[PDB]
């Protein structure tokens with residue numbers, strides 16, 4: 001009973017989280033996941049500032065109100081060669097990664113590893129934070145508050 005949370009560097013507080021390295025987070029789960037990180041879904045403005053500090057991914061993830069990909073460099077296989085905060089317009093499906101925003105983070109690029117999920121609650125799941133450099137932190141707990149998400 002195990003969940004990997006793959007996390008990125010923070011840029012102006014904003015970071016990307018993949019559950020098990022595959023699109024698999026609903027909009028309700030995303031809010032709960034950010035909450036467990038003492039974080040919120042970013043606003044578009046917060047995401048634009050993160051972008052300006054060096055944040056890009058090649059993954060769809062929730063922000064507050066939209067599903068987006070932050071892009072600095074044009075890449076044909078990432079948001080169809082767009083740059084800026086690319087907004088997903090048309091999709092059949094409801095599950096993506098998520099972005100989160102932690103106000104207490106440094107103001108620019110923070111590529112130190114994440115070594116806690118400070119606000120997870122008591123639960124049965126072995127949750128493992130996986131950093132991009134492979135550093136891991138695990139704890140037993142839960143973050144999902146919606147039965148539909150479990």
Ligand SMILES: Nc1cccc2c1CCNC2
Pocket residue numbers: 006007008018021130131132133
């Ligand atoms: N950020 C991160 C950490 C561990 C694994 C993976 C990522 C993002 C890209 N997908 C794998």
